[PDB]
RNA sequence: AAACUUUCAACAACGGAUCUCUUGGUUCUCGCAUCGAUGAAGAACGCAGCGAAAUGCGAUACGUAAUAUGAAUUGCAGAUAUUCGUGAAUCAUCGAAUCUUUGAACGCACAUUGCGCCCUCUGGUAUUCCGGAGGGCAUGCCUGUUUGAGCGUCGUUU
RNA sequence: UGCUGUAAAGCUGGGUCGAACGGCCUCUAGUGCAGAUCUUGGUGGUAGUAGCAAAUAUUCAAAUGAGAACUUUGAAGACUGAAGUGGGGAAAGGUUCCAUGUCAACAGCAGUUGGACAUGGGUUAGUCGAUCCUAAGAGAUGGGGAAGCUCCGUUUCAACGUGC
RNA sequence: GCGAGAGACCGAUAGCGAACAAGUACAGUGAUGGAAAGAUGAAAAGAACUUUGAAAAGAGAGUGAAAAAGUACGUGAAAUUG
RNA sequence: UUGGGCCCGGCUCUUGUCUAUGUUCCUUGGAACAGGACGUCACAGAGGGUGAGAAUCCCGUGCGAUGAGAUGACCCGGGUCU
């Protein structure tokens, strides 16, 4: 059971594996369907853009201080800056965020 | 091909009744032909027949039915509609569109705008 | 037996009627397959478990 | 079942699996118009159920199978 | 002698027709069925029997009512009659 | 192949003392298939080695 | 020497391999969301001119209506069936119906085709008895209506 | 019918047959059988062999028939010997019932015979049973347990008449 | 479940148990168990008719490209047999 | 900054109908869908059928065109009345 100068091994296979093996055999599928779902959402509110405008924020720990990374909302403080009400700035594709 | 039905709809109720009791007893007649030929297709012509009378009979009844619930509040299930138990469990429109006035209120003060970029 | 219920008698009348060999006219239709009634029974070979 | 047409002066039927006597009784006299002195019935082996209705003496049972057809 | 001699002893039947299934597989004294578990409310089923599921489920028999209920769901469940073409 | 192709049944081994191999057995009687070897590899209507 | 035994070849048997097929399976992908007290799934029993099964259907019973279509069905037979037409055949489509006895199964019961009771109509010289046809009578719970119960309790009159 | 290769094998002559198939360069795998008391199917020797021997017992003739130890009829001889090889039923069976026809298979010989095969026919109730009553018991309800499937209880800590 | 499209998948002892009247026949008191079984031909053109036979059949003949295709049906291996 | 309803489109779904070019010649064969000659169409040379390997014999395929029926407070593009 323990033979040669081999690498002692981790395989955590004891329980009934096979019964929650999960294949991705439909990634060229969903990738296809995807992009249909993108272009009909697209194509239903056209010209107005998919995509509501994110902040920039810094990405959190000692490790990734450096970067800076989109966030989820512009605080309500920042609307207030540019004078948008948070309630009016939702229907005109700027995010808001009350937590940050 | 047996009597056609058109004919039938253009009758009223007692000349349909007179009509069946006609047949029936032609069918009768004809079964106990069937103990002597014993092939006798004719059978099959009467048979449809008196579906077709009956048919029409039960349709006509039918309707008049209906029109006496036109517009109640009220009616016999069988002239409900019968999609199936479960959207007739669910809301109405008017029911499933019903609103508080607190959000009726911020529907219409922010609608979703139109609007473009790079302009 | 004799004594016997309405319910028995409705199924050993059904199990009669199945017992009949194949009408000869149907062996002649186009396509088909059906030589014989396969379903035969007699009365002291297979028990019809009543 | 002929032989009861004459000897008994019986008419023979077949008949509803569902039906009693009464109905019987009140079918042939509507039918045929002919009055039962009695309504035998019975449930065949094959399963349908025949009955055995005797006329009173008013009636003949053979006039009434010509007038039927079946003899 | 518990061989051919008490086999001519069995002529007391245990189970006759359930009235549910038709399979006599009512049990007399008990009063039950043995296969559907009639009078209980539900029909008896286990998942440790996955033939017996084979053997008496929906599909085996006629589907009366289902058989049309995807003819009505793809016009969605229209009402009234159809009209003649002009 | 199918995950049970070969294994819908209720076979066992008779064990040894019967005269025939020790490989498992349909049970049960009044058809051919009964007594019938089950569940190898080797076996008519057993499912193949190592299933795709 | 025959017979017999054994081997081989040809031919014929037994048998159903091999070969070639294939309205079946299996796996993967895509899309969809639709059972039932308005009675489901299932079961039983029946139904065709001549049918046992399978398939279909429910006493309107291998089906009725409607829409579309446009000459069949076919093993045989036969129309009081049809052909420049409300017209053959068609689960082609399907929105109107029928849907036996059952079954969550619902008047009670069920190893019985057992036993009720109510309403309307009807036959027998009948509000009471017998028969028939139609329509009804389950349970838990909810909202409401009505009739109530309790010195639980309020105001008044002794 | 031969040829080639140490071999695994390949190619060919003749016959049969009737719809697809090969070489070469690569890829791939459910890829090579003599065995597993292997699996499924088939076929032998044994072998025209063991055997077809309990229940006293059969024989003659005629008819039918292609054909008769075995069918029918007659004559005879027998046996069961009323706690029967008789005449009925309960349970169980389910058409085996009866007539007509018939012998491919079955009746461990035979078969013109049959509980076989095919086609028909047949079961009649106010009084016989079921139906009704209660027995040992089973088991709803009101309730009380139990996550629950369900368990207990049978008038039960109940406002219990589908009363007359 | 409903509806589609595919494959370096299987090819009738394989592939679902089931390519077929398959969850069928059949077994078991019951829970349950559970098979076997595809292929004539392009088309039945499925052998008229004569003869021997009690008949089944046979011998002629006939149909067919083929009967070295006769429903005991494409090919028809081996065991085993004449 | 701004309410509602109807009427037609659009979008989504279902479904009806309509469409190119050899069956020319010779040989073999029971049958030509085979071989050879000459071709034709091709946004169609996928697939199936028809008496053998059929783009051109048939259905389809490709290209699209045009009807009808739905469906959507919770999609928009318009009228119209409030
Ligand atoms: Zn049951």
Redesign the pocket.
């Given at each position: 059971a323990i033979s040669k100068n081999l690498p002692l091994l981790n395989n955590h296979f004891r329980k009934h594996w096979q019964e929650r093996v999960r294949?991705?055999?439909?990634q060229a599928?969903?990738k296809?369907?995807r992009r249909?779902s993108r272009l009909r959402k697209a194509?239903?509110?056209a010209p107005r853009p998919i995509d509501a405008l994110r902040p920039v924020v810094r990405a959190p720990t000692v490790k990734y201080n450096r970067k800076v990374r989109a966030g989820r909302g512009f605080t309500l403080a920042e609307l207030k800056a540019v004078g948008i009400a948070p309630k009016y700035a939702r229907t005109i594709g700027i995010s808001v965020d009350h937590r940050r | 091909?047996?009597?056609?039905?058109?004919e039938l709809?253009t009758k009223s109720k007692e000349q349909l009744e007179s009509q069946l009791v006609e047949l029936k007893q032609e069918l009768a007649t004809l079964k106990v032909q069937?103990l002597q030929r014993?092939?006798?297709?004719?059978?099959?012509?009467v048979?449809?027949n008196?579906?077709?009378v009956?048919?029409?009979?039960?349709?006509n009844q039918?309707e008049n039915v209906r029109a006496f619930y036109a517009g109640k509040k009220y009616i016999p299930?069988?002239?409900?509609?019968?999609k199936?138990?479960?959207?007739?469990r669910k809301l109405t429109?008017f029911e499933?569109?019903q609103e508080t006035e607190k959000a009726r209120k911020q529907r219409?003060?922010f609608?979703?705008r139109?609007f473009a970029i790079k302009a | 037996?004799?004594?016997?219920?309405?319910?028995?008698?409705?199924?050993?009348?059904?199990?009669?009627?199945?017992?009949?060999?194949?009408?000869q006219?149907?062996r002649?239709?186009?396509d088909?397959?059906?030589?014989?009634?396969?379903?035969?029974?007699?009365?002291?070979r297979?028990?019809?478990?009543? | 079942?002929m032989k009861?047409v004459e000897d008994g002066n019986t008419l023979?039927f077949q008949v509803?699996?569902?039906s009693?006597?009464?109905?019987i009784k009140?079918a042939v006299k509507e039918l045929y118009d002919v009055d039962a002195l009695?309504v035998?019935?019975?449930?065949?082996?094959?399963?349908?159920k025949?009955a055995?209705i005797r006329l009173t003496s008013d009636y003949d049972a053979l006039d009434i199978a010509n007038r039927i057809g079946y003899i | 002698g518990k061989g051919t001699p008490s086999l001519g002893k069995?002529?007391?039947?245990?189970?006759?027709?359930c009235?549910?299934?038709?399979?006599?597989?009512?049990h007399?004294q008990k009063?039950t069925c043995?296969?559907c578990?009639?009078?209980?409310?539900?029909?008896?089923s286990?998942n440790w029997?996955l033939?017996?599921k084979?053997?008496?489920?929906?599909?085996?028999?006629?589907?009366?009512?289902?058989?049309?209920?995807?003819?009505?769901?793809?016009?969605?469940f229209?009402?009234?009659?159809?009209?003649?073409?002009t | 192949?199918?995950?049970?192709?070969?294994?819908?049944?209720?076979?066992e081994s008779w064990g040894?003392?019967?005269?025939?191999?020790?490989?498992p057995?349909?049970?049960?009687?009044?058809?051919?298939?009964?007594?019938?070897?089950?569940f190898?590899n080797?076996?008519?209507?057993?499912?193949?080695?190592?299933p795709?």
């Open positions: 294949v991705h055999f439909d599928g969903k296809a369907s249909q194509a239903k509110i | 091909a047996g009597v056609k039905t058109f709809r069937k014993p092939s006798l297709p004719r059978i099959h012509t048979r449809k008196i579906a077709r009956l048919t029409v009979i039960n349709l039918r299930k069988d002239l409900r509609a019968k199936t138990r479960a959207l007739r429109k499933a569109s219409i003060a609608p979703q139109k | 037996p004799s004594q016997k219920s309405f319910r028995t008698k409705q199924k050993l009348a059904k199990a009669q009627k199945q017992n009949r060999p194949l009408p006219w149907i002649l239709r186009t088909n397959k059906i030589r014989y009634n396969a379903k035969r029974r007699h009365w002291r297979t028990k019809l478990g009543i | 079942a009861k023979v509803d699996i569902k009693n006597k009464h109905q009140s009695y035998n019935t019975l449930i065949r082996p094959n399963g349908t025949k055995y | 069995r002529h007391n039947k245990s189970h006759t027709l009235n549910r299934c038709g399979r006599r597989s009512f007399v009063k043995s296969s578990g009639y009078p209980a409310a539900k029909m008896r286990h029997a033939k017996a084979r053997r008496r489920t929906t599909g085996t028999g006629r589907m009366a009512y289902l058989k049309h209920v995807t003819r009505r769901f793809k016009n969605g229209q009402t009234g009659v159809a009209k003649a073409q | 192949v199918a995950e049970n192709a070969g294994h819908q049944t209720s076979a040894t003392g019967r005269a025939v191999a020790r490989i057995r349909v049970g049960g009687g009044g058809t051919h298939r009964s007594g019938q070897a089950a190898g080797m076996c008519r209507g057993g499912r193949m080695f190592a795709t």
